[PDB]
Amino acid sequence: KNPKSDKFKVKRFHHIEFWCGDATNVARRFSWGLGMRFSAKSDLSTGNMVHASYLLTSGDLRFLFTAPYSPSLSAGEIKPTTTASIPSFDHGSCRSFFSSHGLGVRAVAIEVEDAESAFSISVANGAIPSSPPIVLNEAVTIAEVKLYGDVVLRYVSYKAEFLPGFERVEDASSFPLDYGIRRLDHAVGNVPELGPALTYVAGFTGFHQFAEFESGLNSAVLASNDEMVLLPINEPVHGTKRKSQIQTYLEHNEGAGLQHLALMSEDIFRTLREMRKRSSIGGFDFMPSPPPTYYQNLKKRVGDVLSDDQIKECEELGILVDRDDQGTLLQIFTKPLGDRPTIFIEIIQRVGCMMYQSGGCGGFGKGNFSELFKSIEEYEKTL
Amino acid sequence: KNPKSDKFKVKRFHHIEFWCGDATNVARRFSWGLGMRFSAKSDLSTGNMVHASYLLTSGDLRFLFTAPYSPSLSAGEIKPTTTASIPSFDHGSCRSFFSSHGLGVRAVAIEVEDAESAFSISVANGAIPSSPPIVLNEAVTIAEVKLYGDVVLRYVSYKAEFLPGFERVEDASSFPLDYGIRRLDHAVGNVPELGPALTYVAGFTGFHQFAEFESGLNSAVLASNDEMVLLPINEPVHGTKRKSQIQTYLEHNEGAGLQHLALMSEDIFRTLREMRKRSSIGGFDFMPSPPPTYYQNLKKRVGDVLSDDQIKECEELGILVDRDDQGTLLQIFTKPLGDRPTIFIEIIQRVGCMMYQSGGCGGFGKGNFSELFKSIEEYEKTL
Ligand SMILES: Cc1c(C(=O)C2=C(O)CCCC2=O)ccc2c1c(=O)n(CC(=O)OCCOc1ccc3ccc4cccc5ccc1c3c45)c(=O)n2C
Numbered sequence: 057k058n059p060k061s062d063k064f065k066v067k068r069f070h071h072i073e074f075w076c077g078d079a080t081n082v083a084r085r086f087s088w089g090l091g092m093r094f095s096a097k098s099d100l101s102t103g104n105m106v107h108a109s110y111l112l113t114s115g116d117l118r119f120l121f122t123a124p125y126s127p128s129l130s131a132g133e134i135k136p137t138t139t140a141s142i143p144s145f146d147h148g149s150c151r152s153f154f155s156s157h158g159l160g161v162r163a164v165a166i167e168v169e170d171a172e173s174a175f176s177i178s179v180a181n182g183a184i185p186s187s188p189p190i191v192l193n194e195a196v197t198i199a200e201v202k203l204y205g206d207v208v209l210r211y212v213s214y215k216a217e218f219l220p221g222f223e224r225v226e227d228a229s230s231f232p233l234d235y236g237i238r239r240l241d242h243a244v245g246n247v248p249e250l251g252p253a254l255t256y257v258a259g260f261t262g263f264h265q266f267a268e269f270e271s272g273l274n275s276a277v278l279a280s281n282d283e284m285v286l287l288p289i290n291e292p293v294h295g296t297k298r299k300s301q302i303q304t305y306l307e308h309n310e311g312a313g314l315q316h317l318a319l320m321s322e323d324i325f326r327t328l329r330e331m332r333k334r335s336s337i338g339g340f341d342f343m344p345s346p347p348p349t350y351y352q353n354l355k356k357r358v359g360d361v362l363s364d365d366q367i368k369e370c371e372e373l374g375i376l377v378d379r380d381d382q383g384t385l386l387q388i389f390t391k392p393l394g395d396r397p398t399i400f401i402e403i404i405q406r407v408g409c410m411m412y413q414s415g416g417c418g419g420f421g422k423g424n425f426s427e428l429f430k431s432i433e434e435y436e437k438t439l
Numbered sequence: 440k441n442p443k444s445d446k447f448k449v450k451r452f453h454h455i456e457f458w459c460g461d462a463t464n465v466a467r468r469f470s471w472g473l474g475m476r477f478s479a480k481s482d483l484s485t486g487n488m489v490h491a492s493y494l495l496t497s498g499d500l501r502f503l504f505t506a507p508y509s510p511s512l513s514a515g516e517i518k519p520t521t522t523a524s525i526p527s528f529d530h531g532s533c534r535s536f537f538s539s540h541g542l543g544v545r546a547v548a549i550e551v552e553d554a555e556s557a558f559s560i561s562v563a564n565g566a567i568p569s570s571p572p573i574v575l576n577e578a579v580t581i582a583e584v585k586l587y588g589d590v591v592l593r594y595v596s597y598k599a600e601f602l603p604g605f606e607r608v609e610d611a612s613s614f615p616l617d618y619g620i621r622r623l624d625h626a627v628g629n630v631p632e633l634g635p636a637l638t639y640v641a642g643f644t645g646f647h648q649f650a651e652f653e654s655g656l657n658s659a660v661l662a663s664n665d666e667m668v669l670l671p672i673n674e675p676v677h678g679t680k681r682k683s684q685i686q687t688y689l690e691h692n693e694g695a696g697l698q699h700l701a702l703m704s705e706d707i708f709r710t711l712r713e714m715r716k717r718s719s720i721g722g723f724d725f726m727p728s729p730p731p732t733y734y735q736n737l738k739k740r741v742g743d744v745l746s747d748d749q750i751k752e753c754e755e756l757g758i759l760v761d762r763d764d765q766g767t768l769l770q771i772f773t774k775p776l777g778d779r780p781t782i783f784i785e786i787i788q789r790v791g792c793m794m795y796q797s798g799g800c801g802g803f804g805k806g807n808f809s810e811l812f813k814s815i816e817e818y819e820k821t822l
């Protein structure tokens with residue numbers, strides 16, 4: 057059931073913003089590791105004396121990396137005279153965020169019809185305001201409300217190129233890397249208590265619970281009207297045999313925050329080949345691969361969707377496969393993106409639910425918790 | 440003249456430590472950009488609940504990247520019970536350093552005969568103590584005194600593998616990258632006043648002034664007995680036509696700090712080919728290349744050292760050449776390593792002064808300030 061109860065018009069995920077200590081080094085690492093090109097900047101060279109912000113793109117996926125300069129460079133400015141291109145930015149907030157949480161996502165940004173309306177309606181319906189609507193160059197409106205922890209949900213609306221004040225990046229510095237990633241599929245938060253988190257966010261968005269179908273978590277998914285904005289939220293389950301990874305996250309993150317970003321690839325085989333080639337030369341590492349019994353067990357569950365060769369290819373790359381009643385999901389998880397065992401990335405591709413493909417086709421891979429356990433148990437027997 | 444007045448026995452540069460917000464992302468970027476392999480770690484996986492530290496090596500060059508975890512992970516510890524592998528580390532110091540200066544060098548470490556003696560003698564002779572001598576696993580001694588700004592000179596001495604508590608890195612995560620870099624040649628500081636800086640450092644080390652031979656700087660070089668530890672220091676010259684780059688550094692860095700690291704290559708042509716291939720895919724950018732008149736002018740000044748083809752190769756890679764009365768220097772400068780226009784890297788190779796090669800052979804390239812200006816002026820005429 058989809059009650060289509062959005063309290064304002066939501067379009068798609070627009071961008072994800074990381075708050076960094078040094079935006080240059082994080083952006084360059086991510087660019088090489090994920091195959092995203094440098095497409096826009098706002099920094100000292102564009103007249104921004106407040107923050108350095110670098111935008112990477114791959115298809116429609118937009119990753120923004122931002123760090124503060126010395127406050128001394130902008131000490132004479134006030135908000136009316138600011139040279140910041142992102143008016144919600146604050147030196148103190150950014151330094152406090154990074155000292156508390158380490159490298160991570162500050163903003164989950166969605167494009168809406170009218171960011172001022174979205175903000176007003178959200179706050180009227182319980183949202184905690186974070187940054188009021190601000191019109192940039194009479195062209196783009198941006199506003200922010202609290203989502204969970206120190207993560208904000210950012211609303212952006214366009215009258216009619218990333219943001220005013222950002223400049224397109226010099227062709228020489230813009231190498232056209234591309235490993236197949238095309239858009240943000242979903243963005244997942246970890247919280248201490250799932251119930252209140254869901255009630256809060258669903259309360260101010262009108263997002264509805266998206267239908268699903270000993271692992272240390274309970275989870276639920278909030279979705280927009282056309283179910284293309286997908287926001288799963290996890291809480292820990294305590295007392296388990298293995299300590300809940302959600303609880304480890306909350307401890308190392310100093311509380312709630314964004315757990316993972318799931319990036320859709322138009323060719324997950326090529327994406328994983330390219331990313332794995334680069335794991336040990338600056339890119340990203342992946343979780344340990346499932347045992348061969350997991351891939352033998354694939355024939356029985358998805359042998360009608362993937363050929364033996366395609367199952368062989370999943371095995372070579374360590375890809376996981378799940379299925380619900382409507383579609384099939386190919387997925388894999390990186391190791392944590394930075395020092396702390398907190399944020400990581402998921403690569404996904406979805407098969408089925410053709411209408412365009414409906415959002416969330418195949419689910420989120422919850423069936424892979426028990427299939428990984430069974431396959432791990434099976435391999436001990438097969439040894 | 441070399442009075443050989445070192446007040447304690449100094450061996451060679453040992454390592455350089457960067458204080459980071461996220462050590463993982465900086466280390467991975469530097470590894471790919473410079474061709475350094477991951478060789479040791481001290482982090483949560485080795486039992487360190489205090490800081491994440493990753494060591495990159497290329498030949499004898501050692502770059503250490505360190506960031507603090509949440510203090511909550513180690514809140515029950517005291518210094519006698521610490522799980523930090525670098526006992527001088529302090530969460531508050533590291534966060535304050537990074538918030539003040541951004542990404543940069545915290546420690547210039549030199550290997551000495553006896554770090555406890557070096558520390559005592561240094562402080563007896565004016566050095567401001569930063570961290571007292573600490574013996575690690577009865578095997579290595581480490582001590583720190585202030586050098587300039589918030590940069591420390593770190594003394595390390597070994598009874599007889601980086602530091603106790605560090606583990607060698609898994610072969611799979613240790614890709615054997617190598618673009619030819621072999622050791623740290625010199626490390627350069629920017630200060631507001633050169634005179635007092637020289638007097639302070641020369642005072643507590645016994646390092647002597649190393650012989651040299653409108654650009655916005657005055658500089659002098661301090662050197663150890665065998666002149667293999669080389670510490671140039673710059674001060675700005677104000678009122679110039681173009682604003683002094685030393686003054687811009689001090690403004691964006693919030694005061695004195697390390698300006699650049701000069702890395703010796705055993706094959707500067709290969710190093711620059713490999714680094715330039717990677718500039719726009721995660722690595723490092725280089726300063727704009729000199730005009731072709733600069734390379735035509737090379738025939739008259741170094742045509743007895745480099746062939747036409749070797750001069751052609753310098754031109755293709757943007758390499759600068761200088762010469763003193765004893766040797767020839769090939770050098771080139773990167774753009775700043777991070778967000779701020781502060782720290783950068785120099786790649787160098789020295790020709791001559793064969794005895795082994797004596798330290799500082801060919802100088803530091805001061806002659807290239809006027810030759811760059813003349814060549815720039817010449818190219819305007821040749822247009
Ligand atoms: C994050 C996620 C999702 C997910 O998207 C998601 C949402 O979108 C919304 C709803 C709720 C939700 O969760 C789905 C499935 C997942 C994961 C996920 O994060 N993870 C790795 C994980 O649990 O991290 C600890 C890792 O546990 C392990 C610890 C130690 C090992 C040692 C050896 C091993 C060998 C072989 C395989 C192993 C697997 C896991 C190992 C392990 C393995 C998985 O496995 N699934 C299958």
Ligand SMILES: Cc1c(C(=O)C2=C(O)CCCC2=O)ccc2c1c(=O)n(CC(=O)OCCOc1ccc3ccc4cccc5ccc1c3c45)c(=O)n2C
Pocket residue numbers: 627656658659671672673684699726727728729730759772785803804805807808811
């Ligand atoms: C750092 C250094 C050393 C050095 O090691 C050193 C020590 O070890 C110890 C003693 C003192 C000392 O200094 C030696 C020589 C250097 C440098 C160095 O840092 N730099 C670049 C620099 O001054 O940074 C602003 C850049 O200025 C420019 C601004 C704008 C441009 C625009 C177009 C251009 C086109 C072509 C060439 C250009 C060159 C410089 C341009 C420029 C160029 C140089 O050039 N030399 C020649």
Ligand SMILES: [Co+2]
Pocket residue numbers: 242244316318402420
């Ligand atoms: Co997911």
Ligand SMILES: [Co+2]
Pocket residue numbers: 625627699701785803
């Ligand atoms: Co130099």
